[PDB]
Amino acid sequence: KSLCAFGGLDAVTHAMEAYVSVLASEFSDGQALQALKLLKEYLPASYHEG
Amino acid sequence: INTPASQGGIGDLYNFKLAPSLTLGCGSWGGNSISENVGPKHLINKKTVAKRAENMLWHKLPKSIYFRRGSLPIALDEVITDGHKRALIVTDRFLFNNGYADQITSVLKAAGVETEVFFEVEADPTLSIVRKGAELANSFKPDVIIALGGGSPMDAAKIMWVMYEHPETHFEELALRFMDIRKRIYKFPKMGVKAKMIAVTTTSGTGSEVTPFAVVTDDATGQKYPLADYALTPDMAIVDANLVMDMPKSLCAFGGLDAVTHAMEAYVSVLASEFSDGQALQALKLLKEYLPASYHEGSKNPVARERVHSAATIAGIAFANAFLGVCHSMAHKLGSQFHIPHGLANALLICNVIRYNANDNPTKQTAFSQYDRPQARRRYAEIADHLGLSAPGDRTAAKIEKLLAWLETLKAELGIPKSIREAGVQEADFLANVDKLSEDAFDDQCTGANPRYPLISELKQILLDTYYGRDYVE
Amino acid sequence: MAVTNVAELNALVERVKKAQREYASFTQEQVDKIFRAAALAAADARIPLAKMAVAESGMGIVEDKVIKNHFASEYIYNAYKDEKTCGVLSEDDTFGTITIAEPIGIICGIVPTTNPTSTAIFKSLISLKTRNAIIFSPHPRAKDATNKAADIVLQAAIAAGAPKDLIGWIDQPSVELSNALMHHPDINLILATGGPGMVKAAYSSGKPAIGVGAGNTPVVIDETADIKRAVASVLMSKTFDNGVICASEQSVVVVDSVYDAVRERFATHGGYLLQGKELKAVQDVILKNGALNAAIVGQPAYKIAELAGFSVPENTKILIGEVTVVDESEPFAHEKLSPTLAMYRAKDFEDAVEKAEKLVAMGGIGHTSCLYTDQDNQPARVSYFGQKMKTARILINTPASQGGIGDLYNFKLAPSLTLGCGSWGGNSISENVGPKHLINKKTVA
Amino acid sequence: KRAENMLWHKLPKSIYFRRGSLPIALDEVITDGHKRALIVTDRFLFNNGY
């Protein structure tokens, strides 16, 4: 830490942006939401211990 | 030959590549016993150890997927610009009698390439049509194979592409080596050397243009053969929606319920990774709005139809990496034996299978229950409250009941009968052939990723309770 | 044409001798077609042979017979597809030497009750791969299944270019026709498999003989292992086809400091402990003449429980006894061929290793042995356990059976059969049987 | 005239993933069929044992 925190926030922004852009089709909304789902549980636990 | 049976002449040795006359011993006395030379390998016993090794998972797809309304002629322009000169089209004869295959040939002959059509595909592949097609293929020698249709023309094209590339490999060793995935032992011959395959779909509700599956029926014995490995997936899939604007109800309802079951199963199987849960849920999300609107009117609403089409191929992406379950196999056999169209077979079966798998914990045929799988109850609950069918304070069994109460109302207005008997199946030949289909749907790859390991006496219970129009309950 | 007396026995032995002498002149490219046709038509009839075997023998489970029949066909086909067994094998052209190969002759084959239909495909296929002939001697209880399997393979092979017969079998066996056929002059190799009764009879006959047997396979659980997965693995592998697979688990040696918890881990699941009078009621039933009572083989747990003389829940799986003495006179130390088990208590790691060696020294043939421990923290215990044990396979955190999830558990393993030895006495490790045990090679110069 | 557009969904051909899958992934480049190789990395990863 905090090399892990930088990559975590990087992936947060990459998933937060690519859902609202004007080229967002329906093949790529689901995996953007899945990426946003998988971070809010497992990111602080990976930050504190590891 | 022309040599004494002794030692010591001149030169190197007579002979120099020979052991002494001793060191050769046998192990018996009686008859026709040849001796052999004794060395250190007769005095050593060798042992082997083996640790527990972990496994790996994957996510494999075609290289490029082009999709939307009106994208067929602008997709196959890039095969004109690079660089192909000869072509072959595999389709069904109903599509050739109407004006559908001409939409490819009229565009391809404008730049000028040799084209021809093989319109002889039955509703099932019959292992002898594919040999005549392969004969046509290596008589013509193309380098682009374009499959059109849905279901049978696609996997017919896959099988007749695998033997155009290797005309010496006989079919029986393909049937013996390659029957399931999860097994990487050993390897497949290298394909894609002198041709490549394009897949164009027509019907909305099968996802066979992204999956590495094929099923071939033999003529003589009536024996099925599955073939499955990731060297049969196409190189490019085209998902257009102008090809499906005129199909009648209820051909759309069958494909809709087919995609419903393909997405419902592949979320709860025991090979479900985290790369393929999201698209299974996206496919389940996109149908509950746009399917009844596409059923009642059409093509007066040219928006819901293309979204149902796209969500069908989303579920096709989903189940090609985490595999299917039990109602798939039972649906294949129940459809192939009674000549029911495939698609309403598993429409009749899914509710009993949901009641089957949702048992609390009978530890009678479980395996590694504390290792990877949470439960099959919890994932059905996750489907139910993702799809938006829950009060804010509930328990699990209420959510499951609200889930399977929903799709019965869906099956109501899509207009399908309530048991197998109303579909027109007599009692005599069904009670004659229930024990034929009971264990025959056990070995047919289920195995499989069902969360609960079945057995044969429990499948005929389902096949009886679906024919009488009851519900599986204990 | 039936076979009951010695005269028609000698008739069909002369017939198959004439046919084998006819067959041993084919080329390499026309043996392989016979091999593919035989393997395919043997793999098609999975279900009817399992139904016939369960109907005739009266014990076993149908689905397990289906899957092990399928696996035993496909492994033998895919392992030996393209192997030089006919004609010239190797040469040294600039020095004159050529190595050629030549067959043995006629093989006798002995088939037990427990795996009646899977061994016939194995022995038939590796016989007619290497240009030989085979005569089967089934067991009187289940005999129609074995003859049906050999018949399916035979007429599969006939319509590909084979001679008029190559395979023979005995109808209505007895105790004298087997000894008549084992001492017939012009047969050359016998293949016996099963229990310790007839492999010693096959050994002491003055002919070449290899025996496919099984020993009592122990499992060692130390204190630094996971407890739930070990019990799950043992209960999964032992109940497979009621435990009639060759060399399944037979004893569990548990170190003391994690002992009692493992007890209730068998109690809150399919296992059922027994610590009182009922041990005598089950020690009087497994061993009646000193020679393994044939009334408790392949049966479920509750049927041998009620035949012992008491009641039990219906959904139970395994009967667990616990003994302290380790000798030949104790009845649980034998191999049992039934869903039963015996467990022991040890002080520490080396005591458990010593007691496991003393268990494996009783079977006569070293086949497998199992250890359940952490493998990412104690490599020294792994090396020590691999050093001291003397069996063919040594398994770490793995059940001694087949069929889990993924590819295979394990995927680089042969079946539990195909491993045979050539002696009985002491410290004899078995090894896997293939076509190189059936071919004598010659050299010219 | 006014023509409409098309969308796509493009990825690598195969993605292998999970804990402990590096040496079993690059076994298939050994089995078929390559003979020469080149590795591009940073010097910090080369100074450590990676």
Numbering used by the authors:
A (entry chain D): 644 to 693
B (entry chain C): 396 to 869
C (entry chain B): 1 to 445
D (entry chain D): 446 to 495
What does the paper say about this structure?
The N-terminal aldehyde dehydrogenase (ALDH) domain converts acetyl-CoA to acetaldehyde, which is then converted to ethanol by the C-terminal alcohol dehydrogenase (ADH) domain.
160,830 particles out of 251,604 particles picked were further processed using cisTEM 14 to generate a 3.5 Å resolution cryo-EM map. Most of the side chains were resolved in the cryo-EM map, and we built atomic models of six complete AdhE molecules and two ADH domains. The cryo-EM structure of AdhE shows that the ALDH and ADH domains in the AdhE monomer are separated by a linker (residues 441–448). Subsequently, two dimers (four AdhE molecules) form one helical pitch via the interaction of ADH domains in a tail-to-tail manner. F670 in the ADH domain is inserted into a hydrophobic pocket formed by F462, I460, and I712 of the other ADH domain and holds the ADH-ADH domains together. This practice reveals that ALDH active sites are located towards the outer surface of the helical structure while ADH active sites reside towards the inner surface. Compared with WT, a dramatic decrease in the AdhE activity was observed for the mutants defective in spirosome formation, implying that the spirosome formation that we observed in the cryo-EM structure is important for AdhE activity.
